[PDB]
Amino acid sequence: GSNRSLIVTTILEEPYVLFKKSDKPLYGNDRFEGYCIDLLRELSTILGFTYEIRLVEDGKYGAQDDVNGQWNGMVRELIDHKADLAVAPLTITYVREKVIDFSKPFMTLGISILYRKGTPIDSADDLAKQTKIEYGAVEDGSTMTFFKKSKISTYDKMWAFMSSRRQSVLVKSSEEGIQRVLTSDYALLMESTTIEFVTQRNCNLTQIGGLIDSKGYGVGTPMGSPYRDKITIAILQLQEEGKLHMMKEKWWRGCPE
Numbered sequence: 001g002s003n004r005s006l007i008v009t010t011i012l013e014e015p016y017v018l019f020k021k022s023d024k025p026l027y028g029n030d031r032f033e034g035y036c037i038d039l040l041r042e043l044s045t046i047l048g049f050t051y052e053i054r055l056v057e058d059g060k061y062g063a064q065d066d067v068n069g070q071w072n073g074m075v076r077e078l079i080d081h082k083a084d085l086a087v088a089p090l091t092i093t094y095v096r097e098k099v100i101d102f103s104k105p106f107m108t109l110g111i112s113i114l115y116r117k118g119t120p121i122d123s124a125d126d127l128a129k130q131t132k133i134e135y136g137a138v139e140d141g142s143t144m145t146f147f148k149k150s151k152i153s154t155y156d157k158m159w160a161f162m163s164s165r166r167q168s169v170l171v172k173s174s175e176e177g178i179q180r181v182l183t184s185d186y187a188l189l190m191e192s193t194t195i196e197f198v199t200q201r202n203c204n205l206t207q208i209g210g211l212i213d214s215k216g217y218g219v220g221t222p223m224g225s226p227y228r229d230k231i232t233i234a235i236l237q238l239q240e241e242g243k244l245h246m247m248k249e250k251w252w253r254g255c256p257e
């Protein structure tokens with residue numbers, strides 16, 4: 001028979017992946033749009049594959065359980081060969097590299113702070129030393145894991161805060177985190193890429209301070225997948241010819257800065 005379609009896991013996160021609005025019902029792959037959907041399209045034509053997009057069943061990016069070491073999210077879907085690729089804003093980190101493979105990065109970012117304007121707050125240190133303004137991150141994503149494992153004094157203190165208040169400050173999605181910033185005294189620890197999108201849509205919101213780390217998003221594959229190196233080559237081509245730059249400008253398109 002013919003070559004089977006690759007199963008591609010991904011996750012809803014604007015402007016990387018969203019449900020396309022339309023007047024008539026959309027089915028299958030047609031339901032989705034965004035930067036990572038355009039990226040997937042390019043990879044499919046460059047490499048020559050067909051695909052089926054499936055949103056990660058548990059709704060998570062992926063983190064490790066303390067007791068049994070098991071992963072969840074898109075990372076686990078790859079480990080168990082439930083997906084061939086993860087094409088998503090999936091952060092490349094060493095602990096993830098121990099269990100899945102990544103392409104070279106298609107976008108760079110660092111953690112920063114999303115908050116409201118008109119406060120004196122200027123850095124993570126300003127949050128860490130107090131408990132009136134709450135703060136948190138998306139549960140079972142790389143930002144949460146960054147704080148959970150960091151030995152940096154400020155970040156360790158911030159994790160102590162988040163851990164004891166997990167149910168109230170760790171959030172199910174970035175969208176929910178943004179809602180917390182709009183509806184309570186709350187600052188979200190969010191990746192800088194995503195903050196740039198959010199603050200250009202909502203002129204009430206701003207980034208606080210700079211980037212506290214530096215890393216990239218990559219396409220994930222199960223360990224040993226032959227697709228990983230081929231996808232790296234494709235990403236480099238897309239980068240060199242200006243396509244990734246154009247794609248970012250398209251999806252990131254107020255507000256004064």
Ligand SMILES: C[C@H](C[C@H](N)C(=O)[O-])C(=O)O
Binds near residue numbers: 062141144174190
């Ligand atoms: C939402 C985001 C997910 C993050 N890009 C990851 O790959 O786990 C975060 O943790 O801030």
